């Protein structure tokens, strides 16, 4: 799915998810690096 740079696609929920939700994790999506 097409998400803006601040989001990433989760295919279980089939939705763009905010990167901010993943920033505290040691392992955020690679595309969330810029935002986080």
């Amino acid at each position, epitope marked *: 799915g097409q998400c803006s740079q601040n989001e990433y696609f989760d295919s279980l929920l089939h*939705a763009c998810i905010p990167c901010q939700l*993943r920033c505290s994790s040691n*392992t955020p*999506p690679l595309t969330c690096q810029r935002y986080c």
Partner: antibody
Amino acid sequence: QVQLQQSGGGLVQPGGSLKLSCAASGIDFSRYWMSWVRRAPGKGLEWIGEINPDSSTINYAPSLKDKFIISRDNAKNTLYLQMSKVRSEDTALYYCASLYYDYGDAMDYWGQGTSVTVSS
Amino acid sequence: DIVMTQSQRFMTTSVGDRVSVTCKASQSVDSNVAWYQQKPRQSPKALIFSASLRFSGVPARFTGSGSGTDFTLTISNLQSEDLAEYFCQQYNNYPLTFGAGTKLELKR
């Protein structure tokens, strides 16, 4: 209140067919992907498949792709599982689910479950 | 098809303790991992998606971690109501596949 109401299972003989129903209310059914999973006696959870909102994408567990047909009727807010050529392995509790992300939250809703027993 | 291995079919624990359930993917699944809870005679409940993110309504004592092949569901301060069976799942590749399940029980 959200309710996935399941109906339509029960007893069937080997080789037979059964159509399970999962009727949704309290959510915009038409926006979301819908899933089927089952739990057979002595086995863990088994994914059966999932169908997108407009039914153009349907994915199945490979062992079930030629026995089971997943469909939906958004005008009735209902998800179906059509079972055929059933066998003892298909005796199980069948659950429908909707997993989605909307209004800023990740949501999961489940039907109450439908028992199927395949037997002579 | 990706195999999700929960090496511990049972885990012994105590109310109040921290418990971690492991799950190992047969090949890399990035962070595309979910965890579910199921009790006898009840529908499953989704706990975690994206390896570390809770579904709405899931208590903060449930956390998830991992990326690649090794994933862990942790319950801090276990409550009696947390005694149940836990399943990991990968959704990196269709078909989605479940692990075999880890049932918690109490030490005595």
